[PDB]
Design a protein around this nucleic acid. Structure first.
Length: 115
DNA sequence: AAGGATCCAA
DNA sequence: TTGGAGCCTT
């Protein structure tokens, strides 16, 4: 059901249209949220750095728990995510979320490679 | 400004 | 051996 939407996303025109890791990163998130805004929330409450906070309803909250985190507003959602990270960390975040929303590792790996 | 590999710390 | 983030090329 959800796996379908994601798989459709990677093939979508606008996904292929994003030109940078971040944009693709945002889109995956935006999409994972609209899929199950509920499950997304739970997967989210359990995702954070060793000192940095990753997602938060307000920006200052990200601005308050780390230095030069690049808070960006996840379009379509009530969440903000940090952006000062390498593609490896981005996949790690996506990976953490999808795992929570219990996705097939196969597809999960498929997504990261597109980031 | 912005993105994100690179590099350093824990 | 995972995570932070100043830093320098777009």
């Amino acid at each position: 059901p959800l796996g379908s939407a994601m798989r459709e996303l990677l093939l979508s025109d606008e996904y292929a249209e994003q030109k940078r890791a971040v944009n693709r990163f945002m889109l995956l998130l935006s999409t994972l949220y609209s899929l199950d805004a509920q499950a997304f929330a739970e997967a989210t409450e359990s995702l954070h750095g060793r000192t940095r906070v990753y997602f938060a309803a307000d920006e200052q909250t990200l601005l308050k728990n780390g230095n030069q985190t690049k808070p960006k507003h996840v379009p379509g959602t009530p969440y903000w995510v940090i952006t000062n990270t390498n593609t490896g960390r981005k996949c790690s975040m996506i990976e953490h979320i999808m795992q929570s929303m219990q996705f097939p590792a196969e597809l999960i790996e498929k997504v990261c490679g597109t980031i």
